[model samples]
Target: GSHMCDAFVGTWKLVSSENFDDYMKEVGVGFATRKVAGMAKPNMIISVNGDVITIKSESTFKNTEISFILGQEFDEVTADDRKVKSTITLDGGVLVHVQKWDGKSTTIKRKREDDKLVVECVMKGVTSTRVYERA
Candidate 1:
């Protein structure tokens, strides 16, 4: 399938985040590590061209990018966390990204819920959601 909406184009600022502590806890990141992750400003770069969608997270601490075809399966290694064998899709005009790692998997669904864009990360025994607005 070809890309429909270009809503993901350009750079997106990290307005705020939630469940950082819980996500870090689940990921086995220490308190100090959590503090550092919280302090860092992570921005997302979304490049959408045709059926190919490339998403990247850039920050002072870490940088990572995941490229995949729409409605196709691919492998991705998250910036902050290392995850592989991720599959992504567009559902209800929202970008649904699912990743499998360490015998577990997580799904992060992103959409414009209300005036702000919301990113909901769901995993077994843990769920972290973050929202972002235009900058």
Candidate 2:
């Protein structure tokens, strides 16, 4: 997981996703919408250019992206289409992102372990973990 930015540029397919529905609910996504979200397997695209990084999350229900340099604040539109303030930094071998909305917040972590890309998202008491394999 300890590698340079160039190591992260790739397209990752969603091999497994768990508890994402609950995380969506926590974020105020309606029940039917979350059900729609839970059924879609999105491709997460990452690009790194030493100083800049971009992440695109695309699915059947929604598609969104964020681009920024490290340790800087930016705007992000979530799967549910809510815009929020977000910042991310590298901690250990992972990228940690803290996203704050109107009074709510969430922490998301991304790490590369062996052949898989791991993503963990937590908000309130709900936590979602997604594993992505190379496309």
Candidate 3:
């Protein structure tokens, strides 16, 4: 297999989460949505077929799926239902996702740590990190 993002190509189950509510708050997520997002433990599914990569965040509350070719922009409807322009790029082997809506923007960094997938969501001055293990 010659996948550039091979490290993330698998299903990962949520193991730990920190500062998610504050992170979402900074992104202007509503109270109801924040409550559900806080309680929902999502599975991250990653896959690649040739040049395109797919990332799916699956949970009981909501499911979000995005497919991208590195460095190209696409329209995305977020889990909280925010419509944004998004792009994914690799930086030091980390999957860096940038989303922009209105005049606001956020970044999500997905990094592989051995057998674990660590995802960091950044908005405004708040940052949240979630850890996942192979499922």
Candidate 4:
């Protein structure tokens, strides 16, 4: 379908992850021997059909995958094993993920520009932006 907006259907290689340490602090509590996520490059693959989607995050350190339907809430465990209830939705083609765990919340927002994918992670006033080039 050459639907220009459907940029997430393919693979994306992580190119730049800006200020990701802030987000890593959340995952660092349990892993003392692992590298920080903000400093690691990962491959992200996304597949979409109807309103359903699956996103897989792969890296040398670990792989975390998730599947969900738009506008529907589901349970997910973070790559680092943090459990949370997440709800995903699209706004004007931009994908938004709202997550809640232990009464706290964070949001991951994704959008595409040409062949680049941008993911923004926001939590406790910190926002980390990661850019992925189409692979």
**Estimated TM-score for each candidate:** 0.85, 0.91, 0.97, 0.88
Can you write out model 2's per-residue Cα lDDT over 1-135, one digit (the tens) per residue? 334765667998899998888888888889888888888889989987667899988878788888999899998877777899999998876899999989989999999899999999999779999999989
Model 4 worst lDDT window (10 residues):
26-35
lDDT value, candidate 2, whole model:
0.87
Clash list (residue pairs), candidate 4: none
Q: Candidate 1: which stretches are off by over 4 Å?
A: 1-3, 30-32
For model 1, residues 3-65, the per-residue Cα lDDT tens digits are: 455776767778878886787677666777688777877787788776778888888878888
Q: Which stretches of candidate 3 lie over 4 Å from their true place?
A: none
Best by TM-score: 3
**TM-score of candidate 3 relative to the true fold:** 0.97
lDDT of 4: 0.81
**lDDT (Cα, tens digit) per residue for candidate 4, span 1-135:** 454336788788999877677576653434442355444688999987666688998987678899898888999988767799999988888999998988888899999877789999988888889999988
Evaluated at residue 1, the lDDT of candidate 4 is 43
Q: Which regions of candidate 4 fall more than 4 Å away from where they truly are?
A: 1-5, 26-34
Question: Against the correct fold, how does model 2 do in TM-score?
Answer: 0.91
